[PDB]
């Protein structure tokens, strides 16, 4: 019932960041974990899908290649790769559980990039 | 023996296991994932208002009590696992007469995964009722809906949901259109609550929105009427002695016109109400009394080439034109 | 009773999966078919439907009681107990047997193990039918059954002098034909499961 | 993709009135959409799904409306405590979002 | 927690008979049944009968299926009613049903806490409804449904129609291809056969025809075509083949029309009102036929003269004492 | 408890029970007591010689082994019963496609007395032959029959006599008749012995008279046949030079005499005889092909005298032969 | 004895036999062979889009468990033990409604062999789809398949082949139609793939060919014979209107009414089929005879004699050379 994320993070442009969220309180293999991106003073962008169960991936068409998202299963636990930074992609990230009639029901505390 | 393994892990799950009840009947809402993959959408049959549907109905659910450790992460067993194990009770809300097939054996499916998950396939021939407003006949378009749900199972009970994005929940196949008439545009689904004399369901609806083609229509009543128009309008060519010739050419109009009035309905149901076909066909029969009453009134007028037909072998067919102009622009866009 | 202890020392340690003598002999059964009425011939689809009593006869050692009582008249309950033929008609397009207002089923088990099996069908059975000469057309309409799993080492069919019995041949359905007369013949036919004896029975129909 | 063009921007009113808010949609849409608050420094939380649904925790002064292709959120009497952004979204397709509707005093 | 409700279940179903009716030795049983119309289908006039789709549920209560322990109104399995008194309840009007078994039979049982059983089906009956078909097509039918219990007598079992009128809803939203539904009206009836006096309840139908369609596939070309039969008095004596030729041919095309009528039409034995209507202006043809032979018996001479001061009154007041009558 | 009284009542008539066995197997005869209540007849379809009917069919008989000494004197029980206990097999000798309806309980009955009488009830639709002789079509009047008896049981085992005497034995619903070509007239009864190649069976009968009406064949077939005869006979009254319209005359009366002996003919089945109704075509069709030969003979002549002969003689003769034809069948 | 030992066989086999299991459940795929012999095709009907086929439809797969020694010979079952060892869930994709016949009993046949290679042989009826390109019609040539498929078992549970290869389907040459004429079929396997697996497919195919027979002395050579008795109409003279009007006026009603009689017994399709064009070329030839005589009454009364001699050598050349394209494209 509650999605723990990480830290915040602050790298330079052009290097890659590990970015992870820990769900607890239930099991990812049911439902659906989305990945969302906040501008600040922007609207949500949506980044990507991804179905632990079967593994499968769907992104956004302007977010493929640099961005992609795995799993596991031991650890319950979701993860985001980001590579080739720049100033655009400073944001905070929130990884969102499906829930009833396909709404975003749970969220995550956020995690703020930023690069220098 | 190796086979064994298998034969004491389904003795085991079936130990104890009550099918009346569903999972989680007091402690939570059984949550029914849905998909349709339709293998040919068939015939559409006006007279009846109702279409044929082939699909590969498929189920999913979470099962707690089918929990099982194994050599096998997926047990694919045959349809007799499936009469013993609780399944949901869906039924189509609009359908009138629909079949499971079951040569050679009953074609079910069910995989019975280790963590207690669920999928249950199916073929049913649903025949459904889609309700048709034939106002624009024969260029209209119809949107065939195909609703179904959990009978003897409330909202807090048993909920459905489609198991990928909406939008990719009901795949038709692409050599599956067995419309000879129509042509299927589209899918379209939705989620909702139906509130009966019993309780609150939830009910899942799939419209197929279709669209008739005139191709029949314009050899069998639109271009036979029109030529028939034609044929009563060279009879203003003719000499005014010659009452015979235009008095057959004005009656065989009049038969041709009616007869294809009579059989142009033979096609669509018994609405009250009239069609653009209807109206097309009331047009050109009045502009076949038209050319008949002229004839009758020059009939009476004899004893030189009569004003009357100079004025009709211009303004009648000026007139068709215009009407023909008018009512294709109307209904065609 | 006495019936009651019969019937139930005759069924225990059967198998009705199992023929009789299923390794030592075939099987013979005399078959025998009463033709209640020909019903019409159809032209444009080319078949002819028949009502009939089909009846067969066979022995089951197994089926052998030493009692007072000679015959066991029984109904149709006894039959889906006892291993039956599974006779079926090879040129028939459809048919059904009757159920109303009990199963149409008939079984007499005699004291030697001889077994009488007649039951009531209606068969929509395959005729060709030349269309030369048409309407001065004379056709033998045939109807061909043998068994379906049981090749000729295992089920050798056999006719009764007494075969095909019609009518009083005046409450038939033939309007347009007149029955002439009908001729029994027996044959081998080779399937690619192995031979089967196959009987038929030729209806000569002219038409009036 | 699916394009939502929820109007307006911001709305600066008092306390204690009724507002409205319109997402529309481009393509149809069918009574999956979604409305989420954003308050500042915090991540949003759900409130409405399918078309008028109220979430558990949402209080009854919230109610949606929807149907194929517009789609609204009508405020009862709105609070101080209330004062954020809000958001709709869609996921009869791949999920996307609008812009963000404010509120100001 | 599941193991309250299974125990509970099993317990219920054990020593149950499913042969002996609740309170079989005491009062009779007093099942209140609710029809909700799916939709009427097709009411066919060839084989009297009308096609009728319900979601026909019954409610008693079984005493021996008390439970003090779950509070919850238990809704089983469709499986379960076969293992439990079902009443057995059918339709004198039948003439084909199947209660629809796909995906699983469409079945319905809920089992509240002090006795009531919920039992509801979901039937599409071909009921026979006897028609009067002389006023045809301004006609008026008055179809009926009528359930009975079957092997249970008035001391046995008793049929009452749940929250009165209330029982049967849903048939202001059916739409008829054809027919309007206007009425409908409920009954409760002990009809008296010679095995026992039975509960009866009927449900009647009220459907009243349309004359929409037969304004312009029949009527219209009966009408208009006596007005191209009333071209002929317009045409010159001394022209024999063209007088002639619109006679023939309005007469023949009414003997064909009269004919392709009555195929869609049952078997009837008696005169509908199409039928007074058609051959009422059959004779006017006559009436135009009998002209031309008699002023060609004189060869205007007043006898053409007359005839268009006669046909558009007498077939004028035709159609008035007609449609007023209807 | 008070249920449970009636649990071991039927638990004890069960024990030891063989459904196999008639009743009385070798102490006697099973006699079985037969009513039907046809709640509706049917339609009677010209074409298959065929008609359907809906009864109520009890059957009655003693089975002493089904006896209580309880509370109650009938056992008034549901369907189950019957699928375990003895039934006789009572088919329908000319039926052909006819089934039970099961909507919603098995439309049966059963009422075990305290005696040891049993009834039995069903509720059929029988589609049963008729034979059908329409040398007389349409004044003909058939009576169609319906015979029943059990099988695999022969007249020393289960004979059939009827509950009531032989006039209220089979009933007809007084609203109940979906004809709509016929009209019942009544019904009378009969028990015989038919013995066929395996014994000697019980074959109680029901004959239902049947009579056709006129009425739609009069104005379908009977009074069009009679306007384009006297339509015919208009051409005697017209111009001896006028060549082309009595033409017309010969060719379109001609022309739909033979639609109306095609049209009128695909209602009845294809028989080897000529009907009563083929009796008035072909001579209808006589009439109308003489006025043609007449014309020819008047314009091969070219008021006549032949022509003049021939609006007297010609409407006078077909008088004459609907005095004759309307007075041997009627 | 022989019957008791072959009874004991088969209650040993029968016994611990689990129905749910296929045979190497666990293990590598079960490979089932498929015979086909074809008794009748009933009804190819183009309205319906189908076509009623019957068939003796048999399988043969290997089942371990189902062994026998003590006995050498053949078992040959009852039809009522299928309800007891495994079969495979073969289903076909365009069968609408089907049927295992039951006269006596149920048609179907169970002959264990010593290995355990069950034979099991069922006579089905069934009715597949085909959809049918009348584009061409009545000179079509359709191609009707019959696509037999595992359900719930994927290509890692099950493989299907034809036994026998080009033997496996037989009785195709002794079927005769009514108006259709077999001229090829062929055996084709391959996997078909969905959202559940992978699954294993045979499909029976034939290459029915119409008969131009019927339809050349029914369809074609009236319209001919019609537009024939068209130009009849040149031949009177300039005054005979009545006998001339007629003649036009009589040909294109008929040719229309025939168009229309024939057009109602085929499916509702919007396209044009050859015998469609075919009949609006003979309608437009009759259509411009008729005013060929209008515009020679008009030229004589209202405003010649040539017209009639261009005519009489116009038309059938133009009508020749109509049906000299129509022959040469469809055909
Ligand atoms: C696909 O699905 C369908 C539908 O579910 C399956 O078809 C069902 O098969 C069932 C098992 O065979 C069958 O149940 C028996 O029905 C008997 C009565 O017959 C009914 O059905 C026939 C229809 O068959 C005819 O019409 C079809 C049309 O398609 C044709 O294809 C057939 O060839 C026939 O022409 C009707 O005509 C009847 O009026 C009935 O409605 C019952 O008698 C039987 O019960 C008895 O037999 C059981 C098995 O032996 C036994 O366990 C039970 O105790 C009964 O035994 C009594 O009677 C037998 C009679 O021989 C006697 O020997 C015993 O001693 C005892 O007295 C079953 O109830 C379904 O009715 C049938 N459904 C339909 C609609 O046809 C189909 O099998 C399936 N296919 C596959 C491959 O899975
Ligand atoms: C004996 C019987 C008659 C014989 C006649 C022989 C001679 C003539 C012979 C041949 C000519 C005809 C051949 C082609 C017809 C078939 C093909 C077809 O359907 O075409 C198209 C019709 O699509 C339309 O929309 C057509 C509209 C036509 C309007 C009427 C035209 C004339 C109007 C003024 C007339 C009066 C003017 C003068 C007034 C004084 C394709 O339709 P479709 O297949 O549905 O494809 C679209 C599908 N979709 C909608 C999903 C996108
Ligand atoms: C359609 O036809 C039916 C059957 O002919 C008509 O049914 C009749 O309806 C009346 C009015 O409801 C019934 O009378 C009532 O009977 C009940 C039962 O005891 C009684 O409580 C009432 O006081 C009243 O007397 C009548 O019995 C019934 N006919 C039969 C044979 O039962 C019906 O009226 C027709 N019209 C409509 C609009 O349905
Ligand atoms: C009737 O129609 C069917 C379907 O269109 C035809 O079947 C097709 O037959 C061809 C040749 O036999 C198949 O091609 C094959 O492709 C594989 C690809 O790997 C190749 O390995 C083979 O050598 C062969 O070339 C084709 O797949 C098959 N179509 C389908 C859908 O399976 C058939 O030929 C037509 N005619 C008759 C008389 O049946
Ligand atoms: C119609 O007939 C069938 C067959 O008799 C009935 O089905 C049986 O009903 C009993 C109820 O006591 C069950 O015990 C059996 O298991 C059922 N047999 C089956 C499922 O084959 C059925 O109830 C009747 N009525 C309906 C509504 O179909
Ligand atoms: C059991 O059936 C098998 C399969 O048909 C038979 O084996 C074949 O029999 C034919 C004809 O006798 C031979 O030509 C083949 O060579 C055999 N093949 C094999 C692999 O053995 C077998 O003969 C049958 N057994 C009997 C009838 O006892
Ligand atoms: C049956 O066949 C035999 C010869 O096989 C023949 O002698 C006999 O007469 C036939 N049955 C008849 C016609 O009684
Ligand atoms: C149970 O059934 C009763 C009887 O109609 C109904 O009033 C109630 O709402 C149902 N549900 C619960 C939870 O009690």
């Known amino acids: 019932v509650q999605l723990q994320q990480s830290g915040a993070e602050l790298v330079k442009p052009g290097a890659s960041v590990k970015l992870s969220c820990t769900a607890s309180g239930f099991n990812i293999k049911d439902t659906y974990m989305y990945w969302v991106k906040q ?78 | ?131 048709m ?178 004025l009709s072998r211009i303004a009648f067919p000026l007139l068709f034109g215009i009407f023909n102009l008018v009512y294709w622009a109307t209904y065609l866009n | 009773g006495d019936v009651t202890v019969i019937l139930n020392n005759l069924l225990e340690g059967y198998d009705n999966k199992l023929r009789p003598d299923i390794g030592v002999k075939p099987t013979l059964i005399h078959t025998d078919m009463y033709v209640n009425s020909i019903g019409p011939v159809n032209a444009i689809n080319m078949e002819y439907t028949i009502d009939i009593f089909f009846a067969q006869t066979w022995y089951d050692r197994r089926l052998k009681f030493n009692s007072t009582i000679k015959v066991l008249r029984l109904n149709s309950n006894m039959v889906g107990k006892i291993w039956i033929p599974d006779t079926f008609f090879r040129n028939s397009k459809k048919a059904d047997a009757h159920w109303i207002t009990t199963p149409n089923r008939m079984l007499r088990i005699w004291n030697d193990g001889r077994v009488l099996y007649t039951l009531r069908l209606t068969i929509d059975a395959e005729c060709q039918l030349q269309l030369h000469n048409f309407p001065m057309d004379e056709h033998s309409c045939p109807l061909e059954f043998s ?49 089967y004896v196959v009987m038929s029975v030729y209806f000569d129909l002219s038409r009036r | 993709n699916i394009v939502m063009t929820q109007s307006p921007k911001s709305m600066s009113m008092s306390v204690g009135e009724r507002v409205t808010l319109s997402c529309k949609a481009s393509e149809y849409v069918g009574t999956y959409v979604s409305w989420y608050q954003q ?4 991540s949003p939380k759900l409130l409405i799904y399918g078309a008028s649904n109220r979430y558990t925790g949402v209080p009854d002064r919230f109610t949606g409306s929807g149907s194929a292709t517009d789609f609204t959120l009508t405020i009862g009497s709105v609070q101080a405590e209330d004062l954020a952004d809000y958001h709709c979204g869609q996921s009869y397709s791949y999920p996307t979002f609008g812009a963000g509707t404010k509120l100001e005093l | 927690n599941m193991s309250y409700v299974k125990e509970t279940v099993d317990r219920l179903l054990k020593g149950y008979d499913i042969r002996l009716r609740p309170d079989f030795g005491g009062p009779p049983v007093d099942v209140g049944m609710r029809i909700d119309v799916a939709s009427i289908d097709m009411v066919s006039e060839v084989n009297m009968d009308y096609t009728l789709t319900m979601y026909f549920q019954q409610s008693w209560k079984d005493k021996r299926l008390s439970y ?79 359930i009975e219990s079957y092997g249970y007598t008035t001391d046995d079992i008793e049929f009452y129609w749940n929250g009165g009128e209330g029982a049967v809803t849903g048939v202001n939203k059916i739409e008829l291809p054809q027919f309007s539904i206007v009425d409908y009206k409920m009954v409760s009836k002990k009809v ?17 025809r349309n004359i929409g369609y037969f304004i312009l596939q029949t009527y219209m070309p009966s009408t208009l075509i006596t007005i191209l039969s009333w071209v002929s008095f317009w045409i010159n004596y001394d022209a024999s083949a063209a007088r002639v030729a619109l006679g023939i041919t309005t007469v023949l095309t009414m003997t064909t029309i009269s004919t392709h009528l009555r195929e869609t039409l049952p078997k009837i034995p008696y005169v509908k009102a199409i039928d007074i209507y058609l051959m009422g202006c059959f004779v006017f043809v006559f009436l135009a036929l009998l002209e031309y032979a008699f002023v060609n018996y004189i060869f205007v001479n007043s006898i053409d003269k007359w005839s268009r001061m006669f046909f558009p009154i007498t077939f004028s007041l035709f159609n008035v004492v007609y449609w007023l009558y209807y």
């Not at chain 1, 992104?59 to 799993?71: E, L, R, S």
């Not at chain 5, 499986?79 to 469409?106: C, E, I, M």
């Not at chain 5, 026992?196 to 459907?207: Q, T, V």
């Open chain 2, 1 to 131: 023996d190796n086979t064994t393994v298998f034969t004491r892990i389904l003795d085991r799950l079936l130990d104890g296991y009550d099918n009346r009840l569903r999972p989680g009947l007091g402690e939570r809402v059984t949550e029914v994932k849905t998909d349709i993959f339709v293998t040919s959408f068939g015939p559409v049959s006006d007279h009846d208002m109702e279409y044929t549907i082939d699909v590969f109905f498929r189920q999913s659910w979470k099962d707690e009590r089918l929990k099982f450790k194994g050599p096998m992460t997926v047990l694919r067993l045959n349809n007799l696992m499936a009469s013993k194990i609780w399944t949901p009770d869906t039924f189509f809300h609009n359908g009138k007469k629909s079949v499971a097939h079951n040569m050679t054996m009953p074609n079910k499916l069910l995989r019975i995964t280790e963590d207690g998950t669920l999928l249950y396939t199916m073929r049913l021939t649903v025949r459904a009722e889609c309700p």
């Open chain 3, 147 to 195: 068994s379906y799993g049981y090749p000729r080492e295992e089920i050798v069919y056999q006719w009764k002098r007494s075969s095909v019995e019609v009518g009083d041949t005046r409450s038939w359905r033939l309007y347009q034909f007149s029955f002439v007369g009908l001729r029994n013949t027996t044959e081998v036919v080779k399937t690619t499961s192995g031979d």
């Open chain 4, 39 to 42: 308050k500042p420094e915090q």
């Open chain 5, 192 to 208: 008296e056969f010679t095995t026992g006096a039975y509960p009866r309840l009927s449900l009647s139908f009220r459907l009243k």
């Open chain 2, 133 to 310: 407003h034939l106002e624009d006949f024969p260029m209209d378009a119809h949107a065939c809906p195909l609703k179904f749900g959990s009978y003897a199972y409330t909202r807090a009970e048993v909920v459905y949901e489609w198991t990928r994005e909406p939008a990719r929940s009901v795949v038709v196949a692409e050599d599956g259109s067995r419309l000879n008439q129509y042509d299927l545009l589209g899918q379209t689904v939705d989620s909702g609550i139906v509130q009966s004399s019993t309780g609150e369901y939830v009910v899942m609806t799939t419209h197929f929105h279709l669209k008739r083609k005139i191709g029949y229509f314009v050899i069998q009543t639109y271009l036979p009427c029109i030529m028939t128009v034609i044929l009563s309008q060279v009879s203003f060519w003719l000499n005014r002695e010659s009452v015979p010739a235009r008095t057959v050419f004005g009656v065989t109009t009049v038969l041709t016109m009616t007869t294809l009035s009579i059989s142009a309905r033979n096609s669509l149901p018994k609405v009250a109400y009239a069609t653009a076909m209807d109206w097309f066909i009331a047009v050109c029969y009045a502009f076949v009394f038209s050319a008949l009453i002229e004839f009758a009134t020059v009939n009476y007028f004899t004893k030189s080439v009569s004003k009357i037909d100079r």
């Open chain 5, 68 to 146: 003090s322990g779950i509070p919850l109104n238990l809704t089983l399995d469709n499986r379960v009613a076969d293992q439990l008194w079902v009443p057995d309840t059918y339709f004198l009007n039948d003439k084909k049903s199947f209660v629809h078994g796909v995906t699983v039979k469409n079945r319905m049982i809920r089992l509240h806490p002090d006795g009531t059983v919920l039992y509801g089906l979901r039937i599409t009956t071909t009921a026979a409804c006897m028609m009067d078909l002389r006023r045809y097509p301004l006609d008026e039918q008055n179809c009926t449904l009528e």
């Open chain 1, 39 to 116: 501008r600040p003073e922007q609207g949500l962008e949506w980044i990507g899908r991804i179905d632990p169960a079967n593994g499968d991936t769907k992104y956004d068409p302007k977010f493929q290649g640099k961005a992609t998202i795995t799993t596991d299963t031991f650890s319950n636990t979701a993860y985001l790769q980001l590579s080739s930074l720049t100033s655009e992609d400073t944001a905070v990230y929130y990884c969102a559980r499906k829930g009833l009639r396909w709404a975003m029901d749970y969220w995550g505390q956020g995690t703020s990039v930023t690069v220098s």
